Amino acid sequence: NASICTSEEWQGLMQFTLPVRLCKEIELFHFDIGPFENMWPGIFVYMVHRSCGTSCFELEKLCRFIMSVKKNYRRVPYHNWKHAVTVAHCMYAILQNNHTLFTDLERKGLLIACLCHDLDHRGFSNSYLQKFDHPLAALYSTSTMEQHHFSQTVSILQLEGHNIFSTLSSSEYEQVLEIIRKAIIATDLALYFGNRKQLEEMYQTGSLNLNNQSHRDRVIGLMMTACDLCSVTKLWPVTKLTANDIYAEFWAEGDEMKKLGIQPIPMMDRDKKDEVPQGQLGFYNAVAIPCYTTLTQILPPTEPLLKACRDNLSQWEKVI
Ligand SMILES: [Mg+2]
Ligand SMILES: [Zn+2]
């Protein structure tokens, strides 16, 4: 059931070359991929090559994988191909600034998990799917969409000539799929709260130990949240435009809820737009700021994400 790219598509990617001007910009946390749509697949290739090495994956398999991933994202307002590449770019910036803290297997796994983290999203929340007994909610009792996204990731790797992980030892192969599974599951914001609280405690008591697998899993989980929410770390006009896409998706869900006779939550109600700035302020205070604060404590080089998030918080305050 997984879509396949065309030969023309992956061969096009193989020949793509990244303009020199962008090489310096892509390294920055605040970089916005927005104006370079045609370059998105090539930007990912470039990031994999810079982080993992030009020989880490067989170029042909990597290009097929990327173009098929693109094909498996829907034309929804927010949880689409653009969001996947944006999240992958933030991961790249985090990894580049903390390079040696992560294994080569983790870097490959995380960049891939980010590209795939919202695969085949339908524009509906786990709350909606569960409330209206969608087949997916029956299959996946908790972290509904996230379990689906990982299932889709595996489905793509199984496609002819798409298994970029085939050269890994049987042990490393199982390890990378676990890194990916955990990383994708971690993008369920419901799990973020507990993870952040635990990490803050470990950090403050000085018990945090990155050679402890369970601790690494938690740090990786917080990195996933940080990447997933990164629109809040861009330049204000970019942050503002992305919020428009987020809300366009939310309001469409809210519209469906009204048809089913249920009044939607304010965030999904298109008739409550004037309350958006307060809603944003609330989210930054309760979710975004704590996320980047704990991430900065654990990985000091990620401080520019927290600074940018704080600047945007100030912008929402100006709106109010
Ligand atoms: Mg998601
Ligand atoms: Zn996402």
mmCIF file of C-alpha atoms and ligand atoms in Angstrom, residues 79 117-118 121 146 149 187 228, ligand 1:
data_model
loop_
_atom_site.group_PDB
_atom_site.id
_atom_site.type_symbol
_atom_site.label_atom_id
_atom_site.label_comp_id
_atom_site.label_asym_id
_atom_site.label_seq_id
_atom_site.Cartn_x
_atom_site.Cartn_y
_atom_site.Cartn_z
ATOM 1 C CA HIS A 79 1.409 17.741 8.631
ATOM 2 C CA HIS A 117 7.755 11.087 11.604
ATOM 3 C CA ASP A 118 4.340 12.220 10.229
ATOM 4 C CA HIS A 121 -0.959 12.013 8.335
ATOM 5 C CA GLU A 146 2.593 7.830 15.676
ATOM 6 C CA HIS A 149 3.802 6.718 11.002
ATOM 7 C CA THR A 187 6.584 12.908 18.731
ATOM 8 C CA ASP A 228 8.744 18.808 15.798
HETATM 9 MG MG MG B 1 2.862 13.869 14.550
#
